Amino acid sequence: KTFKQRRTFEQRVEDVRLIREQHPTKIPVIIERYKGEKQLPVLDKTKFLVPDHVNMSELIKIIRRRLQLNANQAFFLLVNGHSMVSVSTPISEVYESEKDEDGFLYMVYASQETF
Numbered sequence: 001k002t003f004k005q006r007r008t009f010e011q012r013v014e015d016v017r018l019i020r021e022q023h024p025t026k027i028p029v030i031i032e033r034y035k036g037e038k039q040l041p042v043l044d045k046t047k048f049l050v051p052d053h054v055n056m057s058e059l060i061k062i063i064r065r066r067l068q069l070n071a072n073q074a075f076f077l078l079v080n081g082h083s084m085v086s087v088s089t090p091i092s093e094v095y096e097s098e099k100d101e102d103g104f105l106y107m108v109y110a111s112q113e114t115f
């Protein structure tokens with residue numbers, strides 16, 4: 001069901017190595033619905049190539065547009081298992097500190113602050 005279930009560590013690593021080669025300016029991001037989530041829909045895909053100059057505030061807006069949310073639906077984004085300290089951090093900086101050993105940046109969204 002989850003990304004890390006579906007692919008061997010060898011396969012995730014090799015995919016990041018291909019993203020680096022073919023989309024060198026993009027951050028490879030895995031975005032996943034909280035497995036206890038009631039309200040929010042699932043995304044059309046799992047793997048995202050985010051332009052590396054956008055800040056976290058702009059990534060939240062991209063995903064709220066991808067889910068087609070209205071303006072008083074709630075949305076919370078965990079990075080690398082934990083809350084974001086700030087939405088002003090550029091995703092290039094967040095990638096460098098929060099990336100997984102496989103080389104993806106892992107994110108989870110839910111309708112409640114409680115996951």
Ligand SMILES: O=C(N[C@H]1CCCNC1)c1ccccc1
Nearest residue numbers: 041042043044065066067068069
């Ligand atoms: O992506 C979704 N719909 C968009 C596609 C682009 C045009 N506007 C509608 C979507 C959102 C939430 C649940 C399921 C699917």
Ligand SMILES: [Cl-]
Nearest residue numbers: 023024025026
């Ligand atoms: Cl690129």
